[PDB]
Symmetry: C3
């Protein structure tokens, strides 16, 4: 069952990486790297060796969150640059991004008060991560808010519902939802904003 979801993820991001490589300039291509890393992550989840038991008889694939530490750092780089954050602020927000994903994987893997403790830690770093973005004085703020509020913030809600958290929804339901969020935050994100982000980076 869930194998079909993972294979869908492998196929979609293989096509996405191929399109992003050929369609964009042969230089630093973050859209290609984000998609290529996501393929690696979906193959490892499909292989099935790093599953763990989750809430209410579900399963957890905690390497998903560890891989987001890399792929979402690339996305935060693009987002913060698009909002013309300073260099030292871009670095800071990339660090918070790694911290959010790393503690989130820990929250998914561990149990009891440790799940709760890690989830809280991750949530604090996350609030500190998105406050400077959502209150940015950049005119690009609105174009960026929709991915932060709908996509990025969709993940902790999904997590709480999934076997990663309380286990209200099944492992396959969570995985489909994670894949939709992945497509929105990693593929649509670039279809939508690639042109504006590219023009912006050339002016700074």
């Amino acid at each position: 069952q869930i194998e079909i979801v993972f294979a869908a993820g492998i196929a979609l991001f293989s096509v996405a990486a191929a399109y992003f490589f050929w369609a964009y300039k042969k230089d630093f291509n973050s859209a290609f790297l984000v998609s290529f890393i996501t393929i690696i992550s979906y193959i490892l989840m499909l292989e099935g060796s790093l599953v763990s038991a989750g809430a209410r008889g579900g399963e957890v694939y905690a390497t998903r969150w560890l891989f987001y530490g890399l792929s979402c750092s690339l996305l935060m780089y693009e987002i913060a640059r698009f909002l013309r954050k300073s260099q030292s602020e871009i670095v800071f927000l990339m660090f918070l991004t790694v911290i959010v994903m790393g503690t989130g994987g820990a929250a998914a893997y561990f149990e009891g008060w440790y799940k709760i403790g890690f989830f809280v830690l991750s949530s604090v770093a996350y609030v500190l991560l998105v406050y400077p973005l959502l209150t940015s004085v950049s005119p690009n703020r609105s174009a960026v808010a929709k991915y932060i509020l709908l996509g990025w913030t969709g993940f902790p809600i999904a997590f709480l519902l999934a076997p990663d958290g309380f286990g209200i929804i099944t492992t396959t339901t969570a995985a489909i939802l994670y894949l939709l969020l992945d497509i929105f935050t990693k593929v649509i994100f670039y279809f939508d904003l690639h042109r504006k982000m590219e023009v912006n980076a050339q002016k700074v």
Copy 2:
């Protein structure tokens, strides 16, 4: 017993991270990041899944040294910048710092000639790490020597005594000593030097 030490560490660095975030400029805040990472590390040590047997019936929490690879890289960044090292020298010293901590975790985890071999490797990198700092022509050298000599260099001595090394002192004694060294090198360090380091970074 040792749970009380780890919980003390979680509480102290939670308070420290909160103070450093609010008291300092809302930009790249290394003092906040160093403390936040240390919380993560103490929670993982408290959870207890990554303990291993150490010398003389003691225990080893080798993930402490792996986490120092990240948090101490941030500290070395501040220290080398404070001494006005060049950019390429700052990078070099951050690499040596990761190497020291990474091989140190290996030394703590493994046994026999491998403990000795990794300890030596870590000690060589460490000598190369601190020689340019202790012989710096910067007038900030003295302000920096005390953390290097008393705090940073306290760790390999503690390690040799602890179950990580020969096991002369118990796991709880080592942990208390590691926590004191942590407080000195990560919290007092900033109480002491934050102002001078901040003024210095604004001039370069």
Copy 3:
């Protein structure tokens, strides 16, 4: 048997790191770092805890490929700078380098269609990695082609033959071949090019 090969590797790169540290400028010394990391990697392979079964009754030491993610990123930095790639292109190629090694370790460790899938992924990233180098308009291109074609590209061929891939050659034969390739790409590389690369970096 294979212990002798690993100990040869530890000894050679210990001597190489010592020569590179003393002979070159006391600044960012990538030749020293590459060799020092390779020592760490050979000691871990000698210790023997992270072996896995490979093809035709052979063994796989997959941490070799994970460590190349770090040491080869340093080499790609030098190579791309020597070819006067832009900064954003240098970063891109270092990312591809980590991806090649990381998926390569996965390919070595896993089995069946997962070995094949990861090997292909690694091979695609690798083609994208070396195409901008082999078609560079730099006059340094030829001096660089020989390490890419003979050394870097030697590894996937060796991998396919080794127990990492089809298991046509024994684990000890593969290890000797990996060590020769290591010496060529990490030690001869600098004996050959250190002067030209150093003079080049001073002009950019």
